[PDB]
Every structure is written in structure tokens, then in C-alpha cells.
Amino acid sequence: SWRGWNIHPPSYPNGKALESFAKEVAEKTEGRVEPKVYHNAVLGDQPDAIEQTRSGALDFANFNMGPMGPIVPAANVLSLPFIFKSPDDMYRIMDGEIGERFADALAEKNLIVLSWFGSGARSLYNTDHPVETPDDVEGLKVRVMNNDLYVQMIDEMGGNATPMAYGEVYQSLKTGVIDGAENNYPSYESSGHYEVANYYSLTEHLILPECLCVAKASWEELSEKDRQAIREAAEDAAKEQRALWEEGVQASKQKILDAGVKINEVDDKSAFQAKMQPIYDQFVQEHPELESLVTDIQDAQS
Ligand SMILES: O=C(O)[C@H]1O[C@@H](O)[C@H](O)[C@@H](O)[C@@H]1O
């Protein structure tokens, strides 16, 4: 018996892929390993679940790499704004040697990465006006996930930020406690945020991988043959997740458009990116040992 964690609903692309993984694992191990996925963060918010998985209280999970940054230093590289040019670049990079360096870093903190899920690009949405240039972010209080890099990101754009659990964002928008947040289409849609924050502006400022990972303790207990089988199941599940993801993005977009959401491309994404320089400079000064990881990712997209 394995318990697994997903923050999203069962029908979200990630949810479907995880159920496929769970089935394939049970089938390939002849019932020796029987994973059960707990969706909707039933077993805790993301930071607490990461903790429970490191200690082996939870057996597997789909984590966004953003919240992984405060736990695994190398993972913070993935939260540098605009580090990836597109999700396709991110997939190519994460499926190759650079992705292995991230897996190595997570393993040191007791998480065994089996495959990488996509989460598109995250963009700003708010209740007040289209964002066309960085100066339009002035005056907006924007929710971010709990990584200091995201507060720095919003601050450099011109606004102000506040870290908050995903589950709380909807009501916080409804009550006016925050003016906006940022995410991909499927989250913006499935969470209901689009019902309150009607302006979605395509900053596409973060392209965050997500892992499908196992507690090191749970991993080590297995036979060698079952590890090989579960690794295969995870790879198949990620392939499925990425296919479901593309469809899901288009379906979510059409739904929010039909609902009257105002979507705008920004004037010039490079103007937002240029403002991020101090973030990169400070990062590589703090972490000289991670500088070559930053430059290797940048260089791999020329
Ligand atoms: O903004 C957030 O908290 C959420 O964003 C979504 O894109 C991620 O898939 C989910 O893991 C995060 O919890």
C-alpha cells in the first residue's frame, strides 16, 4: 500500500496521469505495490506534503518545483523568471542531462524523481485592468507561491506580492484581500479564479517543471525489479500527462473565453524579462555553485 499526493482535482491532467501511474504500478508489480492517489490536497498543502514525503509518511507525489526551491537549493534555478523560452524547451532540457542534475539534488533531500510533468507557462491575472507593460503591475497586490524569488519577481515588475496557499486564493480574490495572482490556463480555470479576476495578461513569466517522485524510504524497500517497473510506469504517466496537458490548456482557454474573460498579450515580454536581471545577479552571487546550471540552461536554448 502506497499513498500519493496531488493538489489538483482528479480530473485535472495531472490527476488523470497519476491514476494511470497508480494502475500501471499495481499491474506491473502484480499487486505488490498498490498506490492510491489522494487528490485535492486532502492530505495537506504542498509544503507540508513535501515534508511528509521526504520523511516517508507519504509514499509518492506530484510536486511543483516552485515550492521545492526553499527545500532544495538547485531547484530554485527553475524559479528564475523567464529562464525557459517555452515549455517545449523545458521538456527537452529536463528529459536530458540537465534534468538528471535536478533529480540528483532532490535525491539528496530524500525524494526520488521518476518523471517530469509539464505545467505550461504562468501569467498574471487581476481584477482591475489589462497589464500591457511592467508599469501596469504598479498598485496590484498579487498572490504568489511561497518562494521568495516570486516576491522579488513581482516587486521588480512594480507591484507587491503576498505568499499564500493555492486553496485560499479564490476567496481572497472574492473578498478583495488581493487584486490578482498568476498561473497557467488550467489552474486559472479549474480553481475558479477566472470568475473573479477577469483580466489575464500573457506575461508567461515562469515555466515550472513538476516531478512525479517517491519517498526515498519507500523506494529503497522495493525489489530491484519493482523499481524498474515503477520507473517505467512513471515515464509512461509523464508522456500521458504532457499530451493531456496540451488538450487541457486549449479546453481551459476556450472555457474562460466563453465566460467573458479578457485575455491580452503583453506589449513586450522582453521588457518584463529585462527587469529580472537583479534577481539573476543576486542568485548567482548567493549560489556560485549553481551558476553553471543557470548558464547551461540558458545556453541550451540558443
Ligand atoms: O499556484 C499554485 O499554488 C499551484 O500552481 C499550479 O500551477 C501547480 O500545478 C500547483 O502544484 C500549484 O500548487
From Swiss-Prot:
Q: CDD domains per the record? A: PBP2_TRAP_SBP_like_3
Annotated beta-D-glucuronate binding lies at H8, Q46, R122, R143, Y166, N183, N184, E210
What binding partners and quaternary form does the record give? The complex is comprised of an extracytoplasmic solute-binding protein and a heteromeric permease formed by two transmembrane proteins.
Where it mainly occurs, coarsely classed, is periplasm
Alphabetized GO MF terms: carbohydrate binding
UniProt-listed Gene3D superfamilies: Bacterial extracellular solute-binding protein, family 7
Its source organism is Chromohalobacter salexigens (strain ATCC BAA-138 / DSM 3043 / CIP 106854 / NCIMB 13768 / 1H11)
- Keyword Cell inner membrane (UniProt): no
Give the function comment from the record.
Answer: Solute-binding protein that binds D-glucuronate (in vitro). Probably part of a tripartite ATP-independent periplasmic (TRAP) transport system that mediates solute transport into the cytoplasm.
Which Pfam families does the record cross-reference, listed alphabetically?
A: DctP (PF03480)
Keyword annotations for this protein?
Periplasm, Signal, Sugar transport, Transport
Task: Kindly state a single biological-process term from the GO annotations of this entry.
Answer: transmembrane transport
The Gene Ontology CC terms held by the record are:
outer membrane-bounded periplasmic space
Q: Which InterPro entries match?
A: DctP_fam, TRAP_DctP, TRAP_DctP_sf
| Entry keyword annotation includes Transport | yes
The Swiss-Prot or TrEMBL record describes its family as follows: Belongs to the bacterial solute-binding protein 7 family.
Query: Could you identify this protein by its name?
Result: Solute-binding protein Csal_2479
Q: Which NCBIfam families does its entry note? A: dctP, TRAP_S1
List where in the cell it is found.
Periplasm
